[PDB]
Each structure stands twice: as C-alpha cells, then as structure tokens.
mmCIF file of C-alpha atoms and ligand atoms in Angstrom:
data_model
loop_
_atom_site.group_PDB
_atom_site.id
_atom_site.type_symbol
_atom_site.label_atom_id
_atom_site.label_comp_id
_atom_site.label_asym_id
_atom_site.label_seq_id
_atom_site.Cartn_x
_atom_site.Cartn_y
_atom_site.Cartn_z
ATOM 1 C CA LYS A 1 73.770 -67.095 56.332
ATOM 2 C CA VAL A 2 72.616 -65.145 53.163
ATOM 3 C CA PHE A 3 71.659 -61.566 54.147
ATOM 4 C CA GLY A 4 68.930 -59.432 52.477
ATOM 5 C CA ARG A 5 70.264 -56.070 51.193
ATOM 6 C CA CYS A 6 68.322 -53.983 53.818
ATOM 7 C CA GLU A 7 68.958 -56.681 56.505
ATOM 8 C CA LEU A 8 72.761 -56.304 56.020
ATOM 9 C CA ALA A 9 72.663 -52.431 55.872
ATOM 10 C CA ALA A 10 70.884 -52.341 59.319
ATOM 11 C CA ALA A 11 73.407 -54.897 60.741
ATOM 12 C CA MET A 12 76.403 -52.937 59.300
ATOM 13 C CA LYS A 13 74.907 -49.601 60.624
ATOM 14 C CA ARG A 14 74.242 -51.278 64.038
ATOM 15 C CA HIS A 15 77.983 -52.333 64.113
ATOM 16 C CA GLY A 16 79.067 -48.737 63.159
ATOM 17 C CA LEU A 17 80.195 -49.049 59.503
ATOM 18 C CA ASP A 18 78.042 -46.055 58.255
ATOM 19 C CA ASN A 19 80.560 -43.227 57.459
ATOM 20 C CA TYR A 20 83.423 -45.280 59.019
ATOM 21 C CA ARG A 21 86.506 -43.275 57.701
ATOM 22 C CA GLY A 22 84.166 -41.289 55.385
ATOM 23 C CA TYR A 23 82.651 -44.489 53.791
ATOM 24 C CA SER A 24 78.761 -44.365 53.690
ATOM 25 C CA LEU A 25 76.753 -47.584 54.342
ATOM 26 C CA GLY A 26 76.149 -47.871 50.539
ATOM 27 C CA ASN A 27 79.933 -48.576 49.934
ATOM 28 C CA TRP A 28 80.024 -51.512 52.484
ATOM 29 C CA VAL A 29 76.711 -53.096 51.168
ATOM 30 C CA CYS A 30 77.911 -52.649 47.488
ATOM 31 C CA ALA A 31 81.236 -54.377 48.462
ATOM 32 C CA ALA A 32 79.448 -57.262 50.401
ATOM 33 C CA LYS A 33 77.318 -57.859 47.217
ATOM 34 C CA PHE A 34 80.241 -58.172 44.737
ATOM 35 C CA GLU A 35 82.627 -59.926 47.225
ATOM 36 C CA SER A 36 80.291 -62.554 48.838
ATOM 37 C CA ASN A 37 76.839 -61.950 47.311
ATOM 38 C CA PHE A 38 75.863 -61.254 50.997
ATOM 39 C CA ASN A 39 76.818 -64.938 51.895
ATOM 40 C CA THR A 40 78.611 -65.029 55.297
ATOM 41 C CA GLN A 41 79.874 -68.546 54.293
ATOM 42 C CA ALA A 42 81.753 -67.410 51.126
ATOM 43 C CA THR A 43 85.389 -68.704 50.765
ATOM 44 C CA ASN A 44 87.664 -68.107 47.735
ATOM 45 C CA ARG A 45 91.266 -69.511 47.413
ATOM 46 C CA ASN A 46 93.761 -67.104 45.660
ATOM 47 C CA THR A 47 96.716 -68.042 43.362
ATOM 48 C CA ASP A 48 99.197 -67.086 46.153
ATOM 49 C CA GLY A 49 97.609 -69.914 48.298
ATOM 50 C CA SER A 50 95.886 -67.526 50.767
ATOM 51 C CA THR A 51 92.072 -67.674 51.159
ATOM 52 C CA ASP A 52 89.343 -64.950 51.357
ATOM 53 C CA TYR A 53 86.646 -65.490 54.061
ATOM 54 C CA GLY A 54 83.046 -64.212 54.695
ATOM 55 C CA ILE A 55 80.688 -61.341 53.722
ATOM 56 C CA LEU A 56 83.772 -59.011 52.992
ATOM 57 C CA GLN A 57 86.240 -61.773 51.693
ATOM 58 C CA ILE A 58 89.006 -60.952 54.241
ATOM 59 C CA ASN A 59 92.379 -62.546 53.227
ATOM 60 C CA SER A 60 94.511 -65.076 55.245
ATOM 61 C CA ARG A 61 97.899 -63.511 54.054
ATOM 62 C CA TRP A 62 97.518 -60.514 56.486
ATOM 63 C CA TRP A 63 94.285 -60.529 58.516
ATOM 64 C CA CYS A 64 93.282 -63.955 59.892
ATOM 65 C CA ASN A 65 94.633 -67.480 60.740
ATOM 66 C CA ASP A 66 93.483 -70.605 58.721
ATOM 67 C CA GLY A 67 96.786 -72.467 59.610
ATOM 68 C CA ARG A 68 97.587 -73.199 55.844
ATOM 69 C CA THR A 69 98.935 -69.803 54.541
ATOM 70 C CA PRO A 70 102.760 -70.125 55.132
ATOM 71 C CA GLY A 71 104.547 -66.834 56.078
ATOM 72 C CA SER A 72 101.214 -64.979 56.744
ATOM 73 C CA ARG A 73 100.063 -62.565 59.502
ATOM 74 C CA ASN A 74 96.934 -62.587 61.744
ATOM 75 C CA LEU A 75 96.564 -58.797 62.326
ATOM 76 C CA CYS A 76 92.832 -59.098 63.341
ATOM 77 C CA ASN A 77 93.704 -61.857 65.919
ATOM 78 C CA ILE A 78 90.994 -64.396 64.793
ATOM 79 C CA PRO A 79 90.698 -67.787 63.179
ATOM 80 C CA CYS A 80 89.410 -67.109 59.598
ATOM 81 C CA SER A 81 86.554 -69.598 60.567
ATOM 82 C CA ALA A 82 85.213 -66.679 62.768
ATOM 83 C CA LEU A 83 84.536 -64.648 59.549
ATOM 84 C CA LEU A 84 82.024 -67.241 58.173
ATOM 85 C CA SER A 85 79.637 -66.759 61.228
ATOM 86 C CA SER A 86 76.005 -65.468 60.738
ATOM 87 C CA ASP A 87 77.019 -62.869 63.354
ATOM 88 C CA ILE A 88 78.988 -60.197 61.304
ATOM 89 C CA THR A 89 80.714 -58.676 64.459
ATOM 90 C CA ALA A 90 84.133 -60.373 63.552
ATOM 91 C CA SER A 91 84.097 -59.440 59.791
ATOM 92 C CA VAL A 92 83.143 -55.741 60.679
ATOM 93 C CA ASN A 93 85.788 -55.332 63.496
ATOM 94 C CA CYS A 94 88.430 -56.679 61.041
ATOM 95 C CA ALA A 95 87.143 -54.504 58.089
ATOM 96 C CA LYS A 96 87.613 -51.461 60.423
ATOM 97 C CA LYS A 97 91.269 -52.457 60.895
ATOM 98 C CA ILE A 98 91.678 -53.060 57.080
ATOM 99 C CA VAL A 99 90.006 -49.735 55.904
ATOM 100 C CA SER A 100 92.353 -47.849 58.310
ATOM 101 C CA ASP A 101 95.481 -49.698 56.969
ATOM 102 C CA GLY A 102 96.293 -46.692 54.655
ATOM 103 C CA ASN A 103 94.500 -47.468 51.334
ATOM 104 C CA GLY A 104 90.885 -47.219 52.569
ATOM 105 C CA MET A 105 88.301 -49.355 50.764
ATOM 106 C CA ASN A 106 90.752 -49.899 47.748
ATOM 107 C CA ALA A 107 91.771 -52.995 49.935
ATOM 108 C CA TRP A 108 88.692 -54.599 48.296
ATOM 109 C CA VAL A 109 89.333 -54.828 44.548
ATOM 110 C CA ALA A 110 85.558 -55.527 43.898
ATOM 111 C CA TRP A 111 84.940 -52.076 45.615
ATOM 112 C CA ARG A 112 87.527 -50.303 43.493
ATOM 113 C CA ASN A 113 86.167 -52.016 40.333
ATOM 114 C CA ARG A 114 82.369 -52.123 40.978
ATOM 115 C CA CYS A 115 81.389 -49.511 43.667
ATOM 116 C CA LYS A 116 84.011 -46.691 43.587
ATOM 117 C CA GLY A 117 82.551 -43.603 41.794
ATOM 118 C CA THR A 118 79.063 -45.292 41.479
ATOM 119 C CA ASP A 119 75.683 -44.192 43.035
ATOM 120 C CA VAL A 120 76.349 -46.486 46.072
ATOM 121 C CA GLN A 121 73.305 -44.906 47.986
ATOM 122 C CA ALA A 122 71.153 -47.081 45.616
ATOM 123 C CA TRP A 123 72.118 -50.038 47.846
ATOM 124 C CA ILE A 124 70.396 -48.502 51.008
ATOM 125 C CA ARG A 125 67.438 -46.927 49.052
ATOM 126 C CA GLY A 126 64.178 -48.223 50.599
ATOM 127 C CA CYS A 127 65.547 -49.788 53.903
ATOM 128 C CA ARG A 128 64.394 -48.781 57.463
ATOM 129 C CA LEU A 129 67.823 -47.862 59.008
HETATM 130 C C1 LIG B 1 90.509 -56.224 52.474
HETATM 131 C C2 LIG B 1 90.692 -57.629 51.909
HETATM 132 O O1 LIG B 1 91.231 -58.520 52.594
HETATM 133 N N1 LIG B 1 90.103 -57.843 50.756
HETATM 134 C C3 LIG B 1 90.353 -59.036 49.976
HETATM 135 C C4 LIG B 1 91.759 -58.982 49.376
HETATM 136 O O2 LIG B 1 92.693 -58.984 50.414
HETATM 137 C C5 LIG B 1 92.000 -60.177 48.436
HETATM 138 O O3 LIG B 1 93.204 -59.934 47.677
HETATM 139 C C6 LIG B 1 90.843 -60.299 47.462
HETATM 140 C C7 LIG B 1 90.952 -61.569 46.561
HETATM 141 O O4 LIG B 1 91.375 -61.199 45.304
HETATM 142 O O5 LIG B 1 89.619 -60.480 48.241
HETATM 143 C C8 LIG B 1 89.311 -59.329 48.944
HETATM 144 O O6 LIG B 1 89.205 -58.192 48.070
HETATM 145 CL CL1 LIG B 2 70.522 -57.079 46.096
HETATM 146 CL CL1 LIG B 3 75.283 -44.593 51.101
HETATM 147 CL CL1 LIG B 4 99.152 -69.840 58.358
HETATM 148 CL CL1 LIG B 5 74.893 -59.861 62.923
HETATM 149 CL CL1 LIG B 6 90.270 -43.154 52.568
HETATM 150 NA NA1 LIG B 7 97.016 -65.691 58.312
#
C-alpha cells in the first residue's frame, strides 16, 4: 500500500506515535517519506546481508525474522513479512520498541540526515488529524 501524507499521519496518530518519546507526528511522517516513500511494501538489502522492511524500513539484524540474516535477533517478535502489510500496526509497535532502545529516532539514518532539525510540522500541515 502507498499512503497519502495526511492518510499516514492520521494512521500514525491513531496508533499513538504523535509525541511518542517527545517525537511529534511530523518526525514519523518525514521518516516514512525518506525511508519508504510511504510504501508499506518497501524492502532494501544492506551490505551486512540484513534487510530493511516496510514504511519505516525496520532491519532484520535486530528487530524481525526473515530466516536469512545469520546471527540476528527478533526483538519485536514478528516475521519481517508482517512489516510489509497495509495495516501499519506491526511497523508502529516495533518502531515504539526501537525509538525506546536508547538512541531515539537516530535509529533511522534518513531521520538523522533529512528530518532532524528541520521544520517537520510541514509534513502534517493541512491534514484533518
Ligand atoms: C530503526 C531501524 O531499523 N532503521 C533502519 C536501520 O536499522 C538500517 O540500518 C537502515 C538501513 O541503512 O534502515 C533503517 O534506517
Ligand atoms: Cl508527500
Ligand atoms: Cl509535527
Ligand atoms: Cl535469521
Ligand atoms: Cl493501518
Ligand atoms: Cl530521545
Ligand atoms: Na532477525
């Protein structure tokens, strides 16, 4: 599924990401955009042989099971295939575990590089939330 900007903000808000650990909705929408282009079906293979899955590009080394990342963890307790769903429940519940892991939203390099210190409120400007 490819989400509209306002469509994803409402879903993220509905699932309780707005000001989750001090991070406004704009941060999560900005991150979605640069990670996945709002495409729930986004996969990217990394040099290390782990793979990033879904709207927030969650990594198989630590967070999910794809059965082909040797010596990896499954800290979110999900098949990585569950992160590609049009229902964002699984991605959001895992994101919550990741942003609490000590480094906050720095866990998403695209966020550090493209959203951090930006007017991220621009991403929810106009939407009925
Ligand atoms: C929180 C999280 O899993 N983010 C992932 C990161 O782990 C991975 O290294 C990167 C790919 O370079 O994609 C995302 O940023
Ligand atoms: Cl957009
Ligand atoms: Cl915001
Ligand atoms: Cl594995
Ligand atoms: Cl949803
Ligand atoms: Cl933080
Ligand atoms: Na894994």
